[PDB]
Amino acid sequence: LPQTVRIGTDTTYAPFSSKDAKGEFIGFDIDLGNEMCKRMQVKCTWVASDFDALIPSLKAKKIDAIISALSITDKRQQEIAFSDKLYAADSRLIAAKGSPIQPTLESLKGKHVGVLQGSTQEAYANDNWRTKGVDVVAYANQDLIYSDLTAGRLDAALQDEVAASEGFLKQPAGKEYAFAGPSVKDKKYFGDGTGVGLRKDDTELKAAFDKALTELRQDGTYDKMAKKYFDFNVYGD
Numbered sequence: 001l002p003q004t005v006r007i008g009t010d011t012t013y014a015p016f017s018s019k020d021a022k023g024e025f026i027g028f029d030i031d032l033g034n035e036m037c038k039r040m041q042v043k044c045t046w047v048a049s050d051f052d053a054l055i056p057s058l059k060a061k062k063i064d065a066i067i068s069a070l071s072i073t074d075k076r077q078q079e080i081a082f083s084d085k086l087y088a089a090d091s092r093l094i095a096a097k098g099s100p101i102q103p104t105l106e107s108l109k110g111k112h113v114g115v116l117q118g119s120t121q122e123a124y125a126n127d128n129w130r131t132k133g134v135d136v137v138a139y140a141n142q143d144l145i146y147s148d149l150t151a152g153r154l155d156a157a158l159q160d161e162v163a164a165s166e167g168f169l170k171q172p173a174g175k176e177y178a179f180a181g182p183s184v185k186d187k188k189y190f191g192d193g194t195g196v197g198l199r200k201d202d203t204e205l206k207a208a209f210d211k212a213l214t215e216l217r218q219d220g221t222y223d224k225m226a227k228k229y230f231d232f233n234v235y236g237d
């Protein structure tokens, strides 16, 4: 393995990856990433990036790994490799409480919908909704989405369910918002949970993350770390 593993994360997706008041990285990805590094007996440099720059950065070797609620998708498996699943991640719409909005083309035609640049939600939204005349708006970071949502510049936003809920709906910014309809299940766009994104040729590094991850799951470090943030089964199936 490298002496120092450089891990890219988008620090705008609480409670997975965000900054505290003094600019330190916090959230479940950071705790997963630090624990794994600990067991791998390597050093880990955290690197902040816009989400859409992480895969490009990994391919260019500016970073060695991505831990950024990165969904394991068939599209992304063409370009990069992944650890074993870190946690599940479903997609779900939010709008102003008592919006009639549903994640359907019929509900959203006319409306302004925020999605993260580079995300699965952007892929789903662009193909299903933007083509069909929904005003789908793509943002550098999820904080700009929540801000344009509370500004009234966006009718709704699509992102990871658990990010919206712990990161927005249950924080002071989101008290006037709710989920708009149920989660959107779609195998092709949304992938099979999140993992560490790695260069396809880094077989050793993948082997090292996968070994650390099973180890922390066998001894209950995982549920202990998860209970900090979640009162449910974040790992999923």
Ligand SMILES: NC(=[NH2+])NCCC[C@H](N)C(=O)O
Residues within 6 Å of the ligand: 009, 010, 011, 012, 013, 016, 017, 051, 068, 069, 070, 071, 072, 089, 116, 118, 119, 120, 121, 142, 160
């Ligand atoms: N740290 C972040 N900003 N994560 C964005 C995740 C959105 C979605 N899971 C995807 O893989 O596209």
